[PDB]
Design a protein around this ligand. Structure first.
Ligand code: HEM
Ligand code: HEM
Ligand SMILES: C/C=C(\C)[C@H]1C/C=C/C=C(\C)CC[C@@H](O)[C@@](C)(O)C(=S)/C=C2\N[C@@](C)(C3=N[C@@H](CS3)C(=O)O1)[C@@H](O)S2
Lengths: 380, 386
């Protein structure tokens, strides 16, 4: 909520998990909601059918931040049955067995960027040169987007967390660019992600395809960049980077542990109960919105032994960083793969990587909910 | 012969030399002379015979085409080598550029075509097909194959324009050193990343073979050749399609595309000339004997319009069945990227005729301007609408 100078959780989480599992919290908007922090409460909030996303569009419902965007055609603001139809299409697209035509593009973009880091001026900022551009360049290649337009996609997303009409403006260039992009691509015989989306509209409405495309690009850039910058910074400060260099087989569990520990937001999309719901820690009333804090759930000693310790070898790691239930992250398999190949390539090409400053000098983004370091200087 | 022409039509000297003066002197831009072979039978022989040398053109007293350069005088350029070294590097190139490896790059060709036609399709009309399609398509593929950051694409393109040749100066020496340097740094970065692109395959050929200087210069050359030659031929190819209306034949009958690719290669050969061959003793060509130490220019474009080989050679016909052209050269130096090039041209036409069937020249044929200077010929723009 209030800017922290590092990636330390707010201590109000541990307090709420101990004795105030389902208490009000006042959000940046000034409105309040019940904050669920215990794993089991968050699990239930994310899986139960008795909560609605679409109800948060109603004019009286509470908001997390001040403003609009709040789009009625965004996947995150829909309920069954509409919601279910678009997800069926997305499983058909992000077929875990269609990733195979896509793995090479991920590795190629990593090799590209790690090479550039490798011959760059030390000390290098790993954010600007690696962690920020890797996911945007990946999403762009998969959407058949000219590399000349990637910086523009980055700024529109950054703008769309900037003051109302400036955010409507930037949403309007993205939607417009994307619909145009689409018109161009219809009729080519393509096999990229953008192509599979287009061809699902011949099950997706016009505005559905456009907004889904926009969201896939935004979703798959900001979160991954966040998690990866954070993950690398923890690897470097704990010295667990070296563990991955010496034992590359540990990279899978490291990815999971980074997801758990580095969950980029402390908050979550509100859920509205459509009737009185019993969660494990208590009953929450109909019409009283709940915030699921997956970040808090991820550091719950009921589930994770020694929750505040970062351990790349952690075997039991059912984190909620991809959410859960129906809104479970659509790009979960791509993201996990991006993270693995990122760590694989970087530890292979630069084993003797190390932070070029002390942790406490690194600055973190202030405001905009999502938390992450502003720069990660390294040398070797 | 490389003097200004307002279009892509051949020098009429070609028809007269083929008629009555097959192996006659020609003066080159440099001021120096060579024998100009124009008949298909002579050009074939000049390219395939083991009695001609490329390397001997490096000797300081040998004739040159251009008046001063670096990259073409480079001893480590594949085009400036004879067996056995030439053979070593070629077999490395065969183990990289195999028919199988090209079939495993296919999606990346299609994807860059897909991208760029889509942007053609949505462009403000009339769209210049050169700037939006023919120029970027192959440079962007090559760069993708070499792990080159997309921001670095125009640098590669301008450099390659300088080494091709007025725009001539001692600048085609400064360009070589910037490309060479950039590429060496690209290599440094890339060794140890474990990628599966072309540039990785070249590096893993050096490591335990290709020398450092061979690797560097070959990578630079693969970048320049895979862009400038393909770019020109494709632009030329599309322009002839549109001006003949044979574009429509391909839209209505896509199975014609392969013969169209060959006929484009034949008719649109981007050069009037070719790299000098030095005979290493007296050689009897079909049209006459050439003297030891007397250089011959093989004009593959003249050969391609020889009425002894090709009926109605000045007619462009996408249905003409297999008649070996020489646009890829012949013999030992036969173009190493030939199969990527044919594939790039086949996909460009497959994609572009599918997306924009009713494409048409936005201007009169004769209104188009052609690149001046350079050893390649090609139109500056190809404006179109639909
Ligand atoms: C490490 C990176 C990522 C994290 C931490 C992450 C996390 C999440 C989370 C937690 C949600 C659910 C939100 C909620 O229910 O409150 C979500 C939804 C979503 N994710 Fe992400 N994501 C990541 C990467 C990606 C990628 C690469 C894509 C795109 C391919 C993507 C696309 C989506 C979409 C479309 C949704 C909305 C799904 C729905 O509402 O049904 N994610 N993501
Ligand atoms: C339409 C496309 C192309 C044309 C018209 C073309 C033409 C030629 C010709 C005629 C030669 C031989 C010159 C001589 O023997 O004097 C040659 C050499 C060569 N080409 Fe091309 N080429 C094209 C595309 C490519 C591509 C895509 C590559 C890139 C990988 C490439 C790489 C090379 C190399 C490395 C050589 C030198 C081989 C040697 O000297 O042994 N070419 N090309
Ligand atoms: C410009 C040629 C490139 C980029 C490559 C590869 C293969 C092309 C051969 C073709 C298309 C045939 C004609 C070509 O030989 C000619 C006469 O047009 C040219 S362009 C001749 C010369 N060019 C220079 C700049 C170089 N060619 C070699 C090494 S540098 C090269 O890169 O070939 C001069 O040496 S002479």
């Amino acid at each position: 909520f209030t800017p922290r100078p590092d990636g330390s959780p707010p201590p109000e989480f541990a307090e709420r998990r101990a004795g105030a599992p389902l208490a009000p919290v006042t959000m940046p908007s000034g409105d309040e909601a019940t904050l669920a922090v215990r794993y089991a409460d968050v699990h239930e909030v994310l899986t139960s059918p008795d909560f609605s996303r679409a109800a948060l569009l109603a004019p009286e419902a509470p908001r997390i931040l001040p403003g609009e965007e709040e789009d009625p055609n965004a996947l995150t603001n829909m309920d069954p049955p509409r919601h279910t139809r678009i997800r069926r299409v997305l499983a058909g697209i992000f077929s875990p067995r269609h990733v195979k035509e896509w793995h090479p593009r991920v590795a190629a973009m990593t090799d590209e960027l790690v090479g550039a880091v490798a011959t760059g001026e030390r000390p290098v900022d790993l954010v600007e040169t690696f962690t920020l551009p890797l996911p945007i360049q990946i999403m762009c290649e998969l959407m058949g987007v000219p590399a000349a337009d990637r910086r523009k996609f980055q700024l529109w997303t950054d703008m769309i967390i900037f003051t109302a009409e400036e955010r409507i403006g930037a949403a309007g260039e993205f939607t417009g660019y994307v619909s145009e992009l689409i018109e161009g691509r219809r009729g080519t015989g393509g096999d990229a992600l953008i192509d599979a989306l287009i061809e699902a509209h011949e099950r997706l409405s016009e505005a559905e395809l456009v907004h889904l495309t926009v969201m896939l690009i935004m979703a798959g850039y900001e979160t991954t960049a966040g998690v990866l910058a954070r993950g690398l910074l923890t690897l470097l400060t704990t010295g667990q980077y070296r563990t991955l260099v010496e034992e590359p087989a540990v990279i899978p569990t490291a990815v999971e542990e980074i997801l758990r520990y580095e969950a980029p937001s402390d908050g979550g999309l509100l859920r509205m109960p459509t009737k009185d719901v019993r969660l494990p820690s208590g009953v929450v009333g109909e019409g009283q919105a709940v915030m699921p804090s997956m970040a808090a759930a991820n550091r719950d000693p009921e589930v994770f032994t020694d929750p505040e310790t970062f351990d790349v070898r952690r075997a039991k790691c059912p984190h909620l960083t991809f959410g859960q239930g129906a809104h479970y992250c659509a790009g979960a398999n791509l993201a996990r793969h991006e993270l693995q190949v990122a760590l694989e390539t970087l530890t292979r090409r630069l084993p003797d990587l190390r932070l070029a400053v002390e942790p406490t000098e690194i600055e973190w983004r202030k405001g905009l909910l999502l938390r992450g370091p502003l720069t990660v200087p390294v040398t070797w």
